[PDB]
């Protein structure tokens, strides 16, 4: 997150960290056993046994007392996800139940976010050509932008497909960046998934998200 | 290294990998107990006891049979190094001797490079906004560029100070990138240290190095 701020310890209890190999991205706890992230995080299709989910975390890949480490039973990419255009860029993670069938233990630092002043958070690059991830979870306030402004020839043109949305400033500055993929956009309810963007904080190039309200039926059907 | 190629296993035995905390950059073995790198790698001045030097390596931060791990006795930034302009951007690492006073064991994969068709190597970003380092050591062929072309108003203007040099293409493409700082430029003799660049592989923006021949007396004086 470029142009953002360090979030408080109990500010985003719904954010999730995903690890496999040397790869990382974020997510959103929408239910005790369900994490919603981007489809392009898992488009190389790693094994579910290679995936690690950490809930309750503030520093990236640092152990904490409220941190909760979980395994992934399975994940479901959207059936119509396009790796070329990043349309339908959302996936669902199913967490591994313990002996007594409790996936995530709810706490002041671990809590699911509801489904449908917007705020974006992640551990991505704090500068456009940053060498490392953000150690602390960063947060930023980004306004929702209209679809007519999204599909303007000077902003994004025809790249904006149904299911997408804009958030940020047409003047640049504050935006999402590399490493923030799959992270939440909360306006609290989950209103977006950090999906793609041409640059980090460029003028007339705000970040593009996944419209969570556009896929409410898909999430309800595939989280049962 | 953007636009580069995977180097062979015994192609650059003089390259060194430096680790401290979550920070990394490259270097050049110029002597059995001396590694030459960039001054801006160590401008935050970490302790020498926090520095790890790995010689003989092909995959970044991966153990190998020819790999040699060494401690750093001390390092010497250039006394006139400017963090504002990156002039005199070079530093010298002194390796830790063992019981019998042998710092680095020479092998087919560990060998110092001599001091004064140019080639640049490193584990940096393979794309401009890359999320991770290069796993394999990349190499690239970059031509030496004239100082008049360096100081052209359309290329770099007045940013080119004495002790600097250019290497790469005015058309873009192949160049050094983020994560390659301190790495070698060999034309073999060491002719440059990867120092700074405005973008990765931009048109009329080739990478800037440290002219090793400009600081030969300094290196000879401070490696005795």
């Amino acid at each position: 997150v470029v142009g953002g701020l360090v979030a408080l310890r109990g500010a985003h209890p719904y954010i999730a960290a995903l690890y496999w190999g040397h790869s990382f991205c974020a997510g959103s706890l929408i239910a005790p056993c369900w994490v919603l992230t981007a489809a392009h995080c898992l488009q190389d299709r790693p094994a579910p046994e290679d995936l690690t989910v950490v809930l309750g975390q503030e520093r990236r890949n640092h152990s904490c007392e409220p941190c909760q480490t979980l395994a992934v039973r399975s994940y479901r990419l959207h059936e119509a996800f396009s790796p070329v255009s990043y349309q339908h860029d959302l996936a669902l993670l199913r967490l591994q139940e313990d002996a007594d069938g409790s996936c995530a233990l709810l706490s002041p630092y671990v809590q699911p976010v509801s489904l449908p002043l917007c705020q974006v958070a992640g551990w991505g690059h704090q500068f456009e050509g940053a060498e490392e991830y953000a150690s602390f979870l960063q947060e930023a306030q980004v306004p929702f932008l209209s679809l007519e402004r999204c599909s303007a020839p000077d902003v994004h043109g025809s790249s904006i497909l149904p299911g997408m949305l804009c958030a940020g400033f047409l003047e640049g500055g504050t935006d999402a960046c590399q490493g923030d993929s799959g992270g939440p956009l909360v306006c609290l309810t989950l209103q977006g998934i950090i999906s793609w963007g041409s640059g980090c904080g460029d003028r007339n190039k705000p970040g593009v998200y996944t419209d969570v309200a556009y896929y409410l039926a898909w999430i309800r059907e595939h989280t049962v | 290294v953007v636009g580069g190629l995977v180097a062979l296993r015994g192609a650059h035995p003089y390259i060194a990998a430096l680790y401290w905390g979550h920070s990394f950059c490259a270097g050049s073995l110029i002597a059995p107990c001396w590694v030459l790198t960039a001054a801006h790698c160590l401008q935050d001045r970490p302790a020498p006891e926090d520095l790890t030097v790995v010689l003989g390596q092909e995959r970044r931060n991966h153990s190998c049979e020819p790999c040699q791990t060494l401690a750093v006795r001390s390092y010497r930034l250039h006394e006139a190094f400017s963090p504002v302009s990156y002039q005199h951007d070079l530093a010298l690492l002194r390796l830790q001797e063992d019981a019998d006073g042998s710092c680095a064991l020479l092998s087919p994969y560990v060998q110092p490079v001599s001091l004064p068709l140019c080639q640049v190597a490193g584990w940096g970003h393979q794309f401009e906004g890359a999320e991770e380092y290069a796993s394999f050591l990349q190499e690239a062929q970059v031509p030496f560029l004239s100082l008049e072309r360096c100081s052209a108003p359309d290329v770099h203007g007045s940013s080119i100070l004495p002790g600097m040099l250019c290497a790469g293409f005015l058309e873009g493409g192949t160049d050094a990138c983020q994560g390659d700082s301190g790495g070698p430029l060999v034309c073999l003799t060491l002719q440059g240290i990867i120092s700074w660049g405005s973008g990765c592989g931009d048109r009329n923006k080739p990478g800037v190095y440290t002219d090793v021949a400009y600081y030969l007396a300094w290196i000879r004086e401070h490696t005795v």
Partner: antibody
Amino acid sequence: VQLLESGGGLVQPGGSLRLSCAASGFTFSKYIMQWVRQAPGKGLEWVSGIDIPTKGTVYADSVKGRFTISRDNSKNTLYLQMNSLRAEDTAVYYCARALPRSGYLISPHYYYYALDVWGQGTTVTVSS
Amino acid sequence: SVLTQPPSASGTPGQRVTISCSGSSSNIGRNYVYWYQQLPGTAPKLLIYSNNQRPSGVPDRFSGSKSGTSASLAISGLRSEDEADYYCAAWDASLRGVFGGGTKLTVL
């Protein structure tokens, strides 16, 4: 960056043939490799692709079940095993690469899912 | 999937001609459009990607635009070296790159 095709020639109908595409100057691991055929006097026709994200291997319906595309990343070469070659499989077969999309950022420097580099082409004739 | 292109087009040097591609909601209206030029006896050459972007080395006089299920390519400042085959390209629902019929551009 160079792509070189080989293996073309005159084949009887119902025969078999294998094509090869040697790659040089770029990493034969970060790109999608494709076969595109140019029948004489017609247009382009996409045949096969390998290492396409969310897929393993994609075939055109006209060649499905008869053509097999595979890689030898160590040899930096691409194969196309053509079986049951019928009459309208005559074409100039091309080998091309496309860069897949990776993460959040799209850059003007990198040409995603576009066939930027092609090969010279190898001629396959299926006649009796 | 299939993409519809005019069989041929004509122009005078210095003029401006337009090559149009028509598709459906599964290839063009749902994804990017690409343009390739093929001189006789040579491999195709990438002209346009992402519906409006040019690879380095392609003149600024080549312009591409996309509007829903239709895409077009414009060549302004037409020269005698533009006599070639022009193809639109896309990927369908199962990826599987798709090519248009091709247009014969003639420079008269």
